[PDB]
What does this fold into?
Amino acid sequence: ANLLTSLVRAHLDSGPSTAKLDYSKFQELVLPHFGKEDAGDVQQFYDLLSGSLEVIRKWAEKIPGFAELSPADQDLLLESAFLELFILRLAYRSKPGEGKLIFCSGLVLHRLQCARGFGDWIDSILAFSRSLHSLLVDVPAFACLSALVLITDRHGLQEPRRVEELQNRIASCLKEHVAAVAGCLSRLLGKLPELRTLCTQGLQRIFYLKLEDLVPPPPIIDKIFMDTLPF
Amino acid sequence: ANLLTSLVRAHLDSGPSTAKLDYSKFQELVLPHFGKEDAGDVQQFYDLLSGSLEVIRKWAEKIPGFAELSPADQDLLLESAFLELFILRLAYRSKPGEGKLIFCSGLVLHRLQCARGFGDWIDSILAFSRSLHSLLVDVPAFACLSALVLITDRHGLQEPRRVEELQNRIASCLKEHVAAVSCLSRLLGKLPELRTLCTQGLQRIFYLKLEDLVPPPPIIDKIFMDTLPF
Ligand SMILES: O=C(/C=C/c1ccccc1)Nc1cc(-c2ccnc(N3CCC(O)CC3)c2)ccn1
It folds into this structure.
């Protein structure tokens, strides 16, 4: 499809290639005081979240139809999906066999280097990475699935029919791709409860870090945290 | 002197007599079946937390000087200390060696009968309980310690000097008792670990509010919201 091509283009332009993979901060081995953190570890956690939201914004603007939604619907979709998109894209891009987290900037970081900032949550994201990798989801399928995570019904949409029309198009586009390669779906959905648990673990980690307040969360992440709490 | 007697009287009147201990629901063995909490596990968690409210309020009103603080400082101290008072009193009253939780109602429960409701936090509370038990803290020392948890600086106090003056009186009273019978600074060392445990309680309530199997009762919800520094 021209839509499939557009979706694949956007996905590949929103991550690093094997070339601009940045090992400047990668330490095979550092020795953390587990179950504690300092201001620099918490700043880095928030900065990674922030960089991923900046990058996901630019990816979304390249999904045909998305830029023509009301600005409020664009924000609402982006906020509502951000955490799930962060986890899924990190899982899909990372190397769980080498305990390597690969962030959208090209930054590579060892599990042990993420432990202070992220706590348990990063161990759980690596577990989901292994899970995801075993389903051998090809790039064009992933490029569609990530878009379906974004372009979905949400309470508060001004133009929900336009969002449902676009969701239809991307669902169609995915169906057509899995027919073109057949000559996985049911098993991908079996992993979705892990992914929702991981979204929750994210909110729990942000709550924990807001309680501790070593450094305050950036305003845009704080707004997503608050706007994403059903109470 | 007479303050210590007043503090001991309040502490002993705020818990169950070895008479009113209820083992009717105690199960020595469970199969921790259907893992992942249900409505009943969350209801029980909230009910146990709630059972302490009226008890701790009545205990505090029997600490000399406490009723002489502004009513707004009384509410603020009660809300701010609720979770830590719940934990510390539970740690001291429970039998960590047998994984036995004793609630202020007299209800006795095995850790696995409340692990789904409490999550990890019960393991952490029991760890603290073992720690507390090893200090062989006598009742009059504990009667002062619990009061120091309540009568402490808090953000929003109207009369913070009066609260500090009362904290000083109870600190004096404790010091004098521990001389009459390094051990002192190890009792005081428990207040900060008790705050770290408090945080896990807020994490658990946050988690349960997120999941929303059953909503927290209004008084716990208010304490949760009013004790978040943001
Ligand atoms: O009725 C009770 C206790 C009621 C209570 C407890 C705390 C606050 C308010 C009321 N029965 C009961 C009471 C005790 C108890 C009673 C007195 N002391 C201790 N400690 C424990 C170990 C060391 O720290 C030193 C001694 C434990 C233990 C279990 N059940």
